[PDB]
Design a protein around this ligand. Structure first.
Ligand SMILES: [Zn+2]
Length: 124
DNA sequence: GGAATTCGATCGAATTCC
DNA sequence: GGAATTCGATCGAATTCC
């Protein structure tokens, strides 16, 4: 299931993931989208790692993540969410993909907290 | 009937292979 | 180093015991 990353993303501030626990979550930063756009991906896992890797490279974004979180993103692992936003063993930020019942649209990909992601996939 | 386990949709992430 | 395979997690409806 290889494809091309497409999308304009969206402008984010220094409170990027604050609303990552409500609705569909935080959007894909335009800066990040410009770095992934047009690139191929062999799977969503690939896209996920490359995504967090990019975030660790954006100065304005990394400053929002503790040293430990930045270390994880530097190798492709997702940053750890607040302790109250986890769900059992799932304690890392997750990427939600919006798409019809019937492909890497960065305008349909968002960052959510395990807690919030579980509700979404059960109606809320 | 009701408890126990299965399993498919959604995920992160490690292991395995050339 | 990159890509495919395998491992786990969560949830709960559907399905399998007993
Ligand atoms: Zn989702």
């Amino acid at each position: 299931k290889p494809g091309k990353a497409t999308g304009k993303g969206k402008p984010v501030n220094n409170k990027w993931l604050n609303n990552a626990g409500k609705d569909l979550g935080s959007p894909v930063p335009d800066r990040i989208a410009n770095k992934l756009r047009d690139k191929e991906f062999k799977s969503f896992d690939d896209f996920r790692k490359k995504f967090w890797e990019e975030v660790s490279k954006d100065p304005e974004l990394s400053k929002q993540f503790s040293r430990n979180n930045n270390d994880r993103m530097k190798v492709g692992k997702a940053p750890k969410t607040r302790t109250q936003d986890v769900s059992g063993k799932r304690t890392s930020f997750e990427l939600h993909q919006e798409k019809p019942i019937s492909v890497y649209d960065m305008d349909n990909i968002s960052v959510v907290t395990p807690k919030r992601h579980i509700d979404i996939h059960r109606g809320k």
